[PDB]
């Protein structure tokens, strides 16, 4: 049950650094506690700020501003492989930014056997222009001629008397 | 003394033994429907709906 | 004891109201409010004696 949590944090003020800078980023975490722990690890990678050296100031979840309108989302991700250094960027069409994020995690966990710790969300953006779309499958989902039969029909009440029609 | 353990939550009579306040609580209180002052900083919304 | 229960409930409800009002104001004028660090946690043992 992922949800997009905004995290703002800063280092502990002291006589050397009376006013710390405000660092804010949007990350997808299933709960507040996961979000805060991920934020600290990200800051250690980038700014090298320890948990004791700093403190979180505000945590807030972001709903989809237009959850009822279909959109296309492009995410840039760096993934750890046998070499431990890989980068990818993917596009998905979904009605919720979290829905896009959890969709990519499943795809990463299937194609590359990707773990939550290994994956780091680099960039999130909204795809709106038709020419911006690059992947072939979403391109097929973009043209107005989208029409096809329902795939994977297959539709305890065991021992059904008649043969199933399995048609229209 | 205290042959059995009776739950203060489950048993209302033991609650009166331990809580000489449970007689008057009225836990639910109407603290709304009074022209609610929607509180949200405009710049807070701007930084919320970014990237 | 009954009166001390009145004061405690009033203290608890005021504390919750103050904290909620504290965050509403900060969100209203844009400043960020960090809540006070808790002093009480409840620990639960999860691993046996082996």
């Amino acid at each position: 049950a992922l949800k997009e949590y905004q995290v703002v944090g800063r280092k502990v003020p002291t006589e050397h650094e009376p006013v710390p800078k405000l660092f804010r980023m949007r990350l997808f975490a299933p709960n507040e506690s996961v979000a805060k722990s991920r934020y600290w690890y990200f800051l250690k990678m980038i700014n090298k700020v320890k948990k004791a050296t700093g403190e979180i100031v505000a945590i807030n979840e972001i709903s989809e501003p237009k959850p009822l309108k279909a959109k296309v989302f492009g995410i840039w991700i760096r993934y750890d492989s046998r070499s431990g250094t890989h980068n990818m960027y993917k596009e998905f069409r979904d009605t919720t930014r979290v829905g896009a994020v959890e969709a990519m995690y499943a795809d990463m966990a299937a194609r590359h056997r990707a773990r939550f710790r290994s994956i780091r969300i680099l960039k999130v953006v909204e795809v709106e222009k038709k020419e911006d779309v690059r992947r072939n499958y979403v391109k097929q989902l973009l043209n107005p001629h989208l029409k096809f039969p329902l795939p994977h029909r297959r539709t305890k009440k065991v021992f059904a008397p008649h043969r199933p029609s399995t048609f229209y | 003394a205290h042959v059995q353990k009776k739950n203060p939550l489950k048993n209302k009579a033991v609650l009166s033994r331990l809580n000489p306040y449970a007689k008057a609580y009225k836990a639910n209180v109407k603290i709304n429907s009074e022209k609610t002052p929607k509180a949200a900083g405009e710049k807070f919304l701007s930084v919320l709906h970014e990237n | 004891i009954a009166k001390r229960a009145e004061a405690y409930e009033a203290e608890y409800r005021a504390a919750e109201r103050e904290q909620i009002e504290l965050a509403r104001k900060a969100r209203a004028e844009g400043n960020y409010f960090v809540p006070h660090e808790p002093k009480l946690i409840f620990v639960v043992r999860i691993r046996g004696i082996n």
């Binding site: 840039w76 | - | 400043n31 960090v34």
Partner: peptide, 18 residues
Amino acid sequence: AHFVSTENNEPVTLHPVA
């Protein structure tokens, strides 16, 4: 509990380095 100010210290977005 202390009000952390934001004047002249607006939050800055950071994203992981590729």
